[PDB]
């Protein structure tokens, strides 16, 4: 027990009704942290993500990416005829996204390492945007901002890399492709622009690559990712 915030309000760092300020509990959940609360929830539902509601107890996992420092999931407890509020939000770090922004709007909430305005490319074309990652350990966000259709469902499904010989490339599940476990996924939408990404923490068994396709009207593009280790 080293990454648990326990708040005891019923009958491993244990907080109680003393850490509250005016019956409020602002909780900064580190990316590698867990929060287990023990109380009787007012409406038995909460968190205006991955949460587990079990009897008079609740557990919440910190999301890898946070868009606005104000976004937060709020629980209200009722112990001994008293109301206590717990605000939970992850530590605000403006992580960059290692991918290609194909969209043209510049007032986005997300920052991409590479970018390629698909609106400018020729019709009936297929231009590539490559993104590479080369670290021993990873703690990065890889995604894209496509103003139109995205192929396949990225990044839960991905497109195999190109074959030198005349062999077909298929759609695979990212978990199998990069061969790691707790891959976190995240989606977003700014008007018509779709923002699909995935997180990656830890090392990697074998240097592998994949592709995700973005089409808009008669124009098309594709982002090729490559991550390495060992």
């Amino acid at each position: 027990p080293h990454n648990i915030l326990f708040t005891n309000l019923t009958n491993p760092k244990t907080y109680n009704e003393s850490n509250f300020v005016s019956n409020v509990l602002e909780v900064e959940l580190n990316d590698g942290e867990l929060f287990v609360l023990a109380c009787e929830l007012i409406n038995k539902k909460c968190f205006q993500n991955k949460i587990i509601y079990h009897k008079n107890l609740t557990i919440f996992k910190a999301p890898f990416y946070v868009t606005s420092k104000d976004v937060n999931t709020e629980c209200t407890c009722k112990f001994k005829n008293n109301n206590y509020k717990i605000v939970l939000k992850p530590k605000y770090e403006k992580k960059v996204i290692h991918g290609c922004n194909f969209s043209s709007n510049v007032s986005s909430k997300h920052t991409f390492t590479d970018s390629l305005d698909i609106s400018l490319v020729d019709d009936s074309a297929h231009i590539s945007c490559n993104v590479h990652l080369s670290e021993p350990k990873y703690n990065h966000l890889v995604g894209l901002n496509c103003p139109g259709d995205i192929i396949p469902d990225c990044f839960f499904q991905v497109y195999q890399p190109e074959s030198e010989e005349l062999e077909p490339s298929n759609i695979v599940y990212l978990d199998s492709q990069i061969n790691i476990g707790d891959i976190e996924y995240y989606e977003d939408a700014e008007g018509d622009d779709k923002i699909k990404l995935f997180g990656i923490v830890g090392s990697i068994p074998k240097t592998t690559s994949f592709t995700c396709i973005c089409k808009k009207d008669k124009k098309s593009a594709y982002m090729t990712v490559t991550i390495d280790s060992a």
Partner: antibody
Amino acid sequence: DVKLVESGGGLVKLGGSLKLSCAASGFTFSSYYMSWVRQTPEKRLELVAAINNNGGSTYYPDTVKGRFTISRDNAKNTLNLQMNSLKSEDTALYYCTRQHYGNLYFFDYWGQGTTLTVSS
Amino acid sequence: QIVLSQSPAILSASPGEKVTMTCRASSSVTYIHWYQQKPGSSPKPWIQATSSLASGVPARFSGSGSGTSYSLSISRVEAEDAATYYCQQWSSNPLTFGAGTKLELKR
């Protein structure tokens, strides 16, 4: 825009040989997988042969392997398919169509086809 | 070799009906391309990567499926949709097409 023009089709007697060519225009020919696909009288589409963007590697289904031979001249924007030892079953309309790795090998452009008749 | 079975062979429907054809593959395939062919012309790219619509293809068209069962669906059939539809795979050499589903529209 993009345009693919088959040519060279006609009547070949049993066991003969014939070369079909395809002219390409309106796109970067060197960056697209080309393929010859036929259509049988029973209205069935079949892949005859395919080639990669740089012309290096090629594939032929066992039905025609060794008998037919695809080729491409990127300097002339042309695709050729030398068919030898033609059998009556090869009677079909042959299309010249393209693909790209960046569109999940989608046949986004076909031709009007050139008609091959293998009979005596 | 992967055999692509298209059912029904002839799909009779009245305008507005919600119709769906089926592409059953012998083994599992990761995607299915869809092409529309109307007499006098070559096949036309219709549905890309199982579900993505080719440029200009009306929104009423839809594609779905996985493994050995894929499909193409029209929400409100229009008169202009009457044609033959072919499904195509290339998860393994060789790339194979389907027999086709010819769309009959009641009149």
